[PDB]
Amino acid sequence: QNFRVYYRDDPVWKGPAKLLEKGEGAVVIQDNSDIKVVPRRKAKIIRDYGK
Amino acid sequence: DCSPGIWQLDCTHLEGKVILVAVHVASGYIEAEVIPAETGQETAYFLLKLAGRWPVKTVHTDNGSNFTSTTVKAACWWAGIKQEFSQGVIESMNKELKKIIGQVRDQAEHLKTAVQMAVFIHNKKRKGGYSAGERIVDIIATDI
Amino acid sequence: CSPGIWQLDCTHLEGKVILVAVHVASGYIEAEVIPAETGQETAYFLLKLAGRWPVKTVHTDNGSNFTSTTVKAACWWAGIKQEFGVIESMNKELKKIIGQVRDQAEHLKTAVQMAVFIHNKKRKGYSAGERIVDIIATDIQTK
Amino acid sequence: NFRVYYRDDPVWKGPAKLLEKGEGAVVIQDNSDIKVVPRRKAKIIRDYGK
Ligand SMILES: Cc1ccc(C2CC2)c(-c2cc(F)c3c(c2C)CCCO3)c1[C@H](OC1CC1)C(=O)O
Ligand SMILES: Cc1ccc(C2CC2)c(-c2cc(F)c3c(c2C)CCCO3)c1[C@H](OC1CC1)C(=O)O
Numbered sequence: 001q002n003f004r005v006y007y008r009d010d011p012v013w014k015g016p017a018k019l020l021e022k023g024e025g026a027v028v029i030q031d032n033s034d035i036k037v038v039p040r041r042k043a044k045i046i047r048d049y050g051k
Numbered sequence: 052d053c054s055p056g057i058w059q060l061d062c063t064h065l066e067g068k069v070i071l072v073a074v075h076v077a078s079g080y081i082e083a084e085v086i087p088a089e090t091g092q093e094t095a096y097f098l099l100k101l102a103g104r105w106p107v108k109t110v111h112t113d114n115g116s117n118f119t120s121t122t123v124k125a126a127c128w129w130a131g132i133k134q135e136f137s138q139g140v141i142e143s144m145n146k147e148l149k150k151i152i153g154q155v156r157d158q159a160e161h162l163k164t165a166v167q168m169a170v171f172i173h174n175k176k177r178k179g180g181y182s183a184g185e186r187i188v189d190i191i192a193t194d195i
Numbered sequence: 196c197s198p199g200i201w202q203l204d205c206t207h208l209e210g211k212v213i214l215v216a217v218h219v220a221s222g223y224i225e226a227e228v229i230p231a232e233t234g235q236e237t238a239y240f241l242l243k244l245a246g247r248w249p250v251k252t253v254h255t256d257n258g259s260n261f262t263s264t265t266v267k268a269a270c271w272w273a274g275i276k277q278e279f280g281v282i283e284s285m286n287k288e289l290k291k292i293i294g295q296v297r298d299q300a301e302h303l304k305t306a307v308q309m310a311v312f313i314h315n316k317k318r319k320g321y322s323a324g325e326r327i328v329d330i331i332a333t334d335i336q337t338k
Numbered sequence: 339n340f341r342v343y344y345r346d347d348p349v350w351k352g353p354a355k356l357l358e359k360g361e362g363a364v365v366i367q368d369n370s371d372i373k374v375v376p377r378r379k380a381k382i383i384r385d386y387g388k
């Protein structure tokens with residue numbers, strides 16, 4: 001059970017990024033070595049459902 | 052971690068339209084769709100459908116921008132598919148598919164109809180002596 | 196015989212038309228969001244289905260897309276016999292899963308294929324995807 | 339072996355028996371009637387998957 005985050009800053013989707021924390025309004029992620037705070041609506045948190 | 056789960060995907064083109072083709076390398080079985088644009092979104096959607104049908108473990112593609120896109124990464128992550136970027140199989144299959152399409156093209160108005168007739172023809176043809184469509188089902192069931 | 200028997204039906208979500216095929220003996224499903232509930236779209240779906248599985252008999256209700264000449268043409272070319280509550284149960288199950296995953300995707304069609312994947316891979320002890328492959332391979336291997 | 343579907347009315351009619359396929363028109367028989375239909379209004383389909 002692990003997660004990667006795909007997100008938009010630019011309508012192009014970025015990712016995968018590491019999920020650092022999830023809140024009711026935002027997700028904190030690390031893409032490469034930059035930490036970013038991303039509104040929930042602009043992020044998809046996707047698990048490796050199919051293994 | 053062997054041949055039952057390994058697929059190759061590539062795009063070919065006819066009549067200005069984009070055809071996305073998947074081949075199960077060990078059987079020669081194929082699936083194809085005419086997609087409206089050669090984008091990550093259309094490729095990811097194709098892959099989710101494919102992964103729901105078969106136990107897709109590895110997909111081998113070239114470096115076309117739709118295959119290296121973020122949207123396809125997301126699809127493979129969710130579905131559990133490893134991407135890798137026996138040799139030249141899909142390129143040979145593209146040619147064979149276009150050959151069959153040309154043989155039946157005048158039997159349908161729409162290119163997509165002839166594409167799917169061609170897929171059917173290829174998958175059902177017994178080489179002896181099983182067909183590609185029989186070979187994939189036999190390979191996967193034995194791997195269960 | 197059970198290897199070749201399928202049921203097809205349309206269901207509706209978000210004003211979109213979902214065409215569902217169920218392999219009766221396994222519970223395996225495939226589905227597509229089609230732009231209109233027409234014979235042309237139904238026939239194209241059947242041609243794709245018949246190219247991947249040994250489709251011998253298809254059971255449907257009497258919806259006009261299923262009784263259309265275009266679908267009769269598909270079934271004649273592909274060698275399919277047409278007959279006129281497995282699929283209905285399956286429509287409800289598919290919609291339940293779709294509802295559970297709907298906010299994970301922008302597009303309804305994405306959620307539909309996620310739900311198909313979820314349904315087909317779930318081990319209830321084999322999954323529907325394992326069962327269809329096993330049923331059909333047994334028929335092939337025993338001639 | 340072959341079926342011809344054809345239009346006159348947007349619904350596809352047939353199947354009819356194929357008698358001759360020309361490049362401009364098709365001669366068919368549908369319920370005792372001999373009909374000549376333009377190629378563009380005809381679909382000639384074989385029971386490939388029998
Ligand atoms: C439009 C869009 C844009 C960006 C993405 C990805 C990078 C974030 C996706 C997408 C693609 C997936 F394959 C996928 C998922 C998503 C969310 C979720 C898990 C199952 O696999 C989609 C997706 O549509 C695409 C035709 C599939 C949608 O409907 O949201
Ligand atoms: C547009 C149209 C109109 C009428 C028909 C039928 C009554 C004559 C067909 C049709 C349907 C088939 F299922 C089919 C074939 C044809 C020709 C050829 C052999 C394999 O199966 C089509 C067909 O498109 C439909 C989405 C498939 C096309 O592209 O020509």
Ligand SMILES: [Cl-]
Pocket residue numbers: 022023024025026027
């Ligand atoms: Cl927050």
Ligand SMILES: [Mg+2]
Pocket residue numbers: 061062113115
């Ligand atoms: Mg290529």
Ligand SMILES: [Mg+2]
Pocket residue numbers: 204205256258
């Ligand atoms: Mg119905």
